Design a protein around this nucleic acid. Structure first.
Ligand SMILES: [Cl-]
Length: 341
RNA sequence: UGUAUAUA
C-alpha cells in the first residue's frame, strides 16, 4: 500500500529528505500525517520552482486532498502561500463542488481558506453555488463556518440571497447554535438594507431572545456594536424588568451590557430602578445582591455609575454590609466594596 | 460565584 519511500520515510530513514526527493510521491505523502506535515513545513520556505513541482502532482486530484484528513492542510497552504495562478487553478478544481465541500468535515476548511485568498470574481462564483441551500449550510456543523466566512469575506451585495433566506426566520436562527453566529456576522459586515429587516425581527423578539441560551449573545452583540437607536429599543425592553432579568442565567448578561452600553440617561434610569422599586421588605438591589447571577449586575452598576449615583448605590448597600457576609453571593459584593472604601 | 463555533 505505502510505497517504500513512504514507509522508509515514516520509519525515519531520511532526516534530510527534501521536497525534490519525493517527486512522483506528493499525493501519497499528502494523504499521510507525517508526509503531509513534511510537505507543509517545506512549503512555507520553498522556492517557487519547488512549490511548483509539488503543485503539478496535486492539481488533478485536488478535490481528493481537500476532503482528506491530512491532505486538506496541503491545499490550504497553496491558498495561503501559493501563487496567484496556483490559487486560481485550485479554485477551478473546486467549481461545482462548493456545496458538498462546505458540508465536508475537511473540505469546508479549504472553502474557508479559498474565500480569504481568491479574487471577488471567484468568491462570487463560490457563493452563488450555495444559492438555494442557505439554511442547510447554516444548520450544518461544517457549512455554517463557510457561511460566516462568506459574510466576512465577500462583497455584502453578493450575500443578499442569504439575507432573503433569514427573512422571517431571524428569531428561529438567533436561538439556533450556528445561526446565532451567522446573524452576528451579518450585523458586522452587511449593508443597511440588509441589517435593517433583521434588526426589526430582533426587536420583535427581544423578550424571548434575552432569555435564550444563544439568543442573548445576539442581543448583547447589538448592544456592543449597534446603532444607539437599536440599543435603546433593547434597553426599553429591560426597563421595568431589571430585577427579574438579573436573576436569570442568560438575561442577566444582557442586563449588564445594558448598564454598560446604555446612554447616560438610560444607565441612570436602570440603576435607579433597582435603587427605588422594592422587592418585598427591602429593595430590588438587596435581593439582587444575594442572587447567584444578580450580584454581577449590582457590581457592574457600581462600576459604571456616575460618581454621584454611585453614592446612592453605596448608601443603599451600606445598611446590609454586616449581613451580606452570611450569604454566598453577597460576600462577593463586599469584595467589590473594598475597591471603593 | 454565571452561558455559544468546529479537523492531525
Ligand atoms: Cl518506490
Amino acid at each position: 500500500g505505502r510505497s517504500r519511500l513512504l514507509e522508509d520515510f515514516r520509519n525515519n530513514r531520511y532526516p534530510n529528505l527534501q521536497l525534490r526527493e519525493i517527486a512522483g510521491h506528493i499525493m501519497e505523502f499528502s494523504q499521510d500525517q507525517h508526509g503531509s506535515r513534511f510537505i507543509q513545513l517545506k512549503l512555507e520556505r520553498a522556492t517557487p520552482a519547488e512549490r511548483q513541482l509539488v503543485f503539478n502532482e496535486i492539481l488533478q486530484a485536488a478535490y481528493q486532498l481537500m476532503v482528506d484528513v491530512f491532505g486538506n492542510y496541503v491545499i490550504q497552504k497553496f491558498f495561503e502561500f501559493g501563487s496567484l495562478e496556483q490559487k486560481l487553478a485550485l479554485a477551478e478544481r473546486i467549481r461545482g463542488h462548493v456545496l458538498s465541500l462546505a458540508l465536508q468535515m475537511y473540505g469546508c476548511r479549504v472553502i474557508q481558506k479559498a474565500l480569504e485568498f481568491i479574487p471577488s470574481d471567484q468568491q462570487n462564483e463560490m457563493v452563488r453555488e450555495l444559492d438555494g441551500h442557505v439554511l442547510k449550510c447554516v444548520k450544518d456543523q461544517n457549512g455554517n463556518h463557510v457561511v460566516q466566512k462568506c459574510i466576512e469575506c465577500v462583497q455584502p451585495q453578493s450575500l443578499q440571497f442569504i439575507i432573503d433566506a433569514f427573512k422571517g426566520q431571524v428569531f428561529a436562527l438567533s436561538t439556533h447554535p450556528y445561526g446565532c453566529r451567522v446573524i452576528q456576522r451579518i450585523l458586522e459586515h452587511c449593508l443597511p438594507d440588509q441589517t435593517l429587516p433583521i434588526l426589526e425581527e430582533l426587536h420583535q423578539h427581544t423578550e424571548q431572545l434575552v432569555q435564550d441560551q444563544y439568543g442573548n449573545y445576539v442581543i448583547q452583540h447589538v448592544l456592543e456594536h449597534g446603532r444607539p437607536e437599536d440599543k435603546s429599543k433593547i434597553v426599553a425592553e429591560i426597563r421595568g424588568n431589571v430585577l427579574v432579568l438579573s436573576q436569570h442565567k442568560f438575561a442577566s448578561n444582557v442586563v449588564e451590557k445594558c448598564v454598560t452600553h446604555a446612554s447616560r440617561t438610560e444607565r441612570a434610569v436602570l440603576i435607579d430602578e433597582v435603587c427605588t422599586m422594592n422587592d418585598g421588605p427591602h429593595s430590588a438591589l438587596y435581593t439582587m445582591m444575594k442572587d447567584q447571577y444578580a450580584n454581577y449586575v449590582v457590581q457592574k452598576m457600581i462600576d459604571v455609575a456616575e460618581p454621584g449615583q454611585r453614592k446612592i448605590v453605596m448608601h443603599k448597600i451600606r445598611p446590609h454590609i454586616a449581613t451580606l457576609r452570611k450569604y454566598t453571593y453577597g460576600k462577593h459584593i463586599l469584595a467589590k466594596l473594598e475597591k471603593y472604601y
